[PDB]
mmCIF file of C-alpha atoms (C1' of nucleotides) and ligand atoms in Angstrom:
data_model
loop_
_atom_site.group_PDB
_atom_site.id
_atom_site.type_symbol
_atom_site.label_atom_id
_atom_site.label_comp_id
_atom_site.label_asym_id
_atom_site.label_seq_id
_atom_site.Cartn_x
_atom_site.Cartn_y
_atom_site.Cartn_z
ATOM 1 C CA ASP A 1 18.336 1.982 -12.746
ATOM 2 C CA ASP A 2 15.972 -0.005 -10.540
ATOM 3 C CA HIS A 3 12.878 0.533 -12.691
ATOM 4 C CA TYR A 4 11.403 1.632 -16.016
ATOM 5 C CA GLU A 5 8.200 3.594 -16.695
ATOM 6 C CA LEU A 6 5.211 2.224 -18.611
ATOM 7 C CA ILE A 7 2.587 4.660 -19.864
ATOM 8 C CA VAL A 8 -0.808 3.397 -20.967
ATOM 9 C CA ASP A 9 -3.659 5.811 -21.719
ATOM 10 C CA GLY A 10 -1.461 8.485 -20.135
ATOM 11 C CA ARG A 11 -1.566 6.488 -16.885
ATOM 12 C CA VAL A 12 1.997 6.111 -15.562
ATOM 13 C CA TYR A 13 3.170 2.859 -14.038
ATOM 14 C CA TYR A 14 6.582 2.178 -12.554
ATOM 15 C CA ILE A 15 7.934 -1.301 -13.253
ATOM 16 C CA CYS A 16 10.510 -3.139 -11.141
ATOM 17 C CA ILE A 17 13.383 -4.218 -13.448
ATOM 18 C CA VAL A 18 13.964 -7.395 -11.422
ATOM 19 C CA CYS A 19 10.446 -8.880 -11.079
ATOM 20 C CA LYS A 20 8.544 -6.658 -13.569
ATOM 21 C CA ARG A 21 5.954 -5.686 -10.935
ATOM 22 C CA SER A 22 3.718 -2.708 -11.585
ATOM 23 C CA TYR A 23 3.481 0.298 -9.269
ATOM 24 C CA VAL A 24 1.314 3.404 -9.403
ATOM 25 C CA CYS A 25 3.616 5.163 -6.996
ATOM 26 C CA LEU A 26 7.391 5.214 -7.265
ATOM 27 C CA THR A 27 7.848 5.258 -3.472
ATOM 28 C CA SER A 28 5.873 2.019 -3.452
ATOM 29 C CA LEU A 29 8.314 0.626 -5.982
ATOM 30 C CA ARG A 30 11.343 1.587 -3.850
ATOM 31 C CA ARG A 31 9.766 0.074 -0.732
ATOM 32 C CA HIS A 32 9.371 -3.069 -2.810
ATOM 33 C CA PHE A 33 12.798 -3.148 -4.529
ATOM 34 C CA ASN A 34 14.504 -3.151 -1.186
ATOM 35 C CA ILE A 35 13.442 -6.812 -1.013
ATOM 36 C CA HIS A 36 15.674 -7.434 -4.055
ATOM 37 C CA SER A 37 18.660 -5.351 -2.973
ATOM 38 C CA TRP A 38 18.525 -5.557 0.850
ATOM 39 C CA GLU A 39 20.264 -2.181 0.725
ATOM 40 C CA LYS A 40 18.494 -1.157 3.911
ATOM 41 C CA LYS A 41 17.967 -3.505 6.828
ATOM 42 C CA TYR A 42 15.324 -3.355 9.524
ATOM 43 C CA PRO A 43 16.618 -5.401 12.485
ATOM 44 C CA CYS A 44 14.212 -6.240 15.322
ATOM 45 C CA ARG A 45 15.161 -4.578 18.606
ATOM 46 C CA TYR A 46 14.015 -7.692 20.540
ATOM 47 C CA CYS A 47 15.637 -10.500 18.627
ATOM 48 C CA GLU A 48 17.958 -11.290 15.743
ATOM 49 C CA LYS A 49 15.489 -11.203 12.831
ATOM 50 C CA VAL A 50 15.990 -8.590 10.090
ATOM 51 C CA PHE A 51 13.338 -7.292 7.687
ATOM 52 C CA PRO A 52 13.379 -5.716 4.210
ATOM 53 C CA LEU A 53 10.421 -3.397 5.035
ATOM 54 C CA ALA A 54 9.990 -1.146 8.047
ATOM 55 C CA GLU A 55 6.342 -2.163 8.425
ATOM 56 C CA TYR A 56 7.244 -5.865 8.651
ATOM 57 C CA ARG A 57 9.588 -5.031 11.461
ATOM 58 C CA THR A 58 6.957 -2.921 13.233
ATOM 59 C CA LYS A 59 4.264 -5.589 13.061
ATOM 60 C CA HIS A 60 6.853 -8.096 14.289
ATOM 61 C CA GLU A 61 7.940 -5.973 17.217
ATOM 62 C CA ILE A 62 4.402 -5.198 18.314
ATOM 63 C CA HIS A 63 3.920 -8.938 18.210
ATOM 64 C CA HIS A 64 6.855 -9.158 20.683
ATOM 65 C CA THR A 65 5.154 -6.903 23.183
ATOM 66 C CA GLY A 66 1.774 -8.667 23.083
ATOM 67 C CA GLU A 67 -0.005 -5.326 22.923
ATOM 68 C CA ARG A 68 -3.594 -5.428 21.640
ATOM 69 C CA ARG A 69 -4.377 -2.223 19.852
ATOM 70 C CA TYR A 70 -7.513 -3.278 18.003
ATOM 71 C CA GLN A 71 -10.749 -3.283 20.051
ATOM 72 C CA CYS A 72 -14.182 -4.473 18.934
ATOM 73 C CA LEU A 73 -16.692 -1.819 19.962
ATOM 74 C CA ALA A 74 -19.574 -4.252 20.001
ATOM 75 C CA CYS A 75 -18.360 -6.355 22.964
ATOM 76 C CA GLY A 76 -15.011 -4.799 23.956
ATOM 77 C CA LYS A 77 -12.630 -7.645 23.129
ATOM 78 C CA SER A 78 -9.133 -6.642 22.027
ATOM 79 C CA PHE A 79 -6.869 -8.086 19.256
ATOM 80 C CA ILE A 80 -3.297 -7.757 18.145
ATOM 81 C CA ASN A 81 -4.116 -6.796 14.544
ATOM 82 C CA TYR A 82 -6.683 -5.900 11.888
ATOM 83 C CA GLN A 83 -7.242 -9.438 10.680
ATOM 84 C CA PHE A 84 -8.118 -10.899 14.103
ATOM 85 C CA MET A 85 -10.422 -7.990 14.812
ATOM 86 C CA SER A 86 -12.127 -8.177 11.367
ATOM 87 C CA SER A 87 -12.477 -11.948 11.592
ATOM 88 C CA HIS A 88 -13.973 -11.515 15.079
ATOM 89 C CA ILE A 89 -16.512 -8.926 14.128
ATOM 90 C CA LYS A 90 -17.612 -10.647 10.912
ATOM 91 C CA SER A 91 -17.942 -14.006 12.627
ATOM 92 C CA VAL A 92 -19.388 -13.106 16.058
ATOM 93 C CA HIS A 93 -21.266 -9.918 15.189
ATOM 94 C CA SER A 94 -22.202 -10.695 11.525
ATOM 95 C CA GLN A 95 -20.975 -7.215 10.627
ATOM 96 C CA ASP A 96 -18.331 -5.697 8.328
ATOM 97 C CA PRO A 97 -15.725 -3.251 9.726
ATOM 98 C CA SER A 98 -14.581 -2.166 6.274
ATOM 99 C CA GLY A 99 -15.237 1.500 5.496
ATOM 100 C CA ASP A 100 -16.185 4.173 8.032
ATOM 101 C CA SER A 101 -18.066 1.625 10.128
ATOM 102 C CA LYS A 102 -17.019 2.643 13.623
ATOM 103 C CA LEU A 103 -17.124 -1.036 14.575
ATOM 104 C CA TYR A 104 -13.563 -0.950 16.019
ATOM 105 C CA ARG A 105 -11.111 1.378 17.623
ATOM 106 C CA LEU A 106 -7.426 1.410 16.801
ATOM 107 C CA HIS A 107 -5.639 2.420 19.995
ATOM 108 C CA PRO A 108 -2.353 4.344 19.830
ATOM 109 C CA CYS A 109 0.702 2.089 20.042
ATOM 110 C CA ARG A 110 1.948 2.288 23.643
ATOM 111 C CA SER A 111 4.092 -0.785 24.111
ATOM 112 C CA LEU A 112 6.872 0.724 21.988
ATOM 113 C CA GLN A 113 7.643 3.976 20.183
ATOM 114 C CA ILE A 114 6.384 4.283 16.559
ATOM 115 C CA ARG A 115 5.008 7.205 14.557
ATOM 116 C CA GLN A 116 1.573 8.525 15.590
ATOM 117 C "C1'" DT B 1 -9.817 -25.158 7.901
ATOM 118 C "C1'" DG B 2 -12.203 -20.180 7.335
ATOM 119 C "C1'" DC B 3 -7.994 -18.206 8.983
ATOM 120 C "C1'" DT B 4 0.177 -15.553 9.027
ATOM 121 C "C1'" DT B 5 2.139 -13.228 5.992
ATOM 122 C "C1'" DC B 6 1.777 -10.511 1.659
ATOM 123 C "C1'" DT B 7 0.486 -6.524 -1.037
ATOM 124 C "C1'" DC B 8 0.623 -1.374 -2.219
ATOM 125 C "C1'" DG B 9 -2.134 3.202 -2.808
ATOM 126 C "C1'" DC B 10 -2.817 6.634 0.129
ATOM 127 C "C1'" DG B 11 -1.404 10.567 3.089
ATOM 128 C "C1'" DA B 12 0.244 12.093 7.672
ATOM 129 C "C1'" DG B 13 4.336 12.848 10.363
ATOM 130 C "C1'" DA B 14 9.320 12.623 10.421
ATOM 131 C "C1'" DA B 15 13.764 13.806 8.370
ATOM 132 C "C1'" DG B 16 16.277 16.403 5.145
ATOM 133 C "C1'" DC B 17 17.496 20.985 3.251
ATOM 134 C "C1'" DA B 18 17.856 25.852 3.103
ATOM 135 C "C1'" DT C 1 13.258 28.046 9.934
ATOM 136 C "C1'" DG C 2 9.143 26.962 6.343
ATOM 137 C "C1'" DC C 3 9.506 24.443 2.467
ATOM 138 C "C1'" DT C 4 10.219 19.734 0.109
ATOM 139 C "C1'" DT C 5 11.160 15.348 0.218
ATOM 140 C "C1'" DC C 6 11.075 11.189 2.261
ATOM 141 C "C1'" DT C 7 9.407 7.396 5.502
ATOM 142 C "C1'" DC C 8 6.158 4.232 6.782
ATOM 143 C "C1'" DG C 9 1.409 3.126 9.317
ATOM 144 C "C1'" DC C 10 -2.670 1.755 7.937
ATOM 145 C "C1'" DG C 11 -6.789 -0.729 5.591
ATOM 146 C "C1'" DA C 12 -8.435 -4.439 3.622
ATOM 147 C "C1'" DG C 13 -8.340 -7.578 -0.244
ATOM 148 C "C1'" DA C 14 -5.021 -11.279 -1.734
ATOM 149 C "C1'" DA C 15 -1.694 -14.713 -1.681
ATOM 150 C "C1'" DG C 16 0.364 -18.252 0.892
ATOM 151 C "C1'" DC C 17 1.497 -22.075 4.655
ATOM 152 C "C1'" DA C 18 0.810 -26.406 7.296
HETATM 153 CL CL1 CL D 201 -3.075 -4.131 25.365
HETATM 154 ZN ZN1 ZN D 202 10.663 -6.460 -7.857
HETATM 155 ZN ZN1 ZN D 203 12.073 -9.808 16.962
HETATM 156 ZN ZN1 ZN D 204 -16.904 -8.178 19.528
#
DNA sequence: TGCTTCTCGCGAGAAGCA
DNA sequence: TGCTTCTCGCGAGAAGCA
């Protein structure tokens, strides 16, 4: 196998046999275990780097295009990810984006083709 | 440094199957 | 197909470099 189950109080966890990490969702555990097996590879279309998770590759690639999908709605400035946007708003606007705040807009990804 | 890269539950599309 | 199963984007707190 790649995991074993661990049931406490009827709550089911899925444990990675390699690093004993705990996962509520099995799909989560798979996504993780690929970093141990490298069974699937996610090569960047723009350079030679390869990634063990699809989302790593996607963040990387969007970084290649320079696209700025995250826009502060308080002053209009755009940012390439959640952390720059959040850091901006907290610091400049002394406000917290977390939750249904409507303090930022996430634009569709246009600089390359991903799910939407 | 307060500010890349990591983490994974959640659920919406995409792919697989019939 | 319409039904299910799978993929992975996303938030946002956390760990990690330097
Ligand atoms: Cl842009
Ligand atoms: Zn593991
Ligand atoms: Zn690349
Ligand atoms: Zn702003």
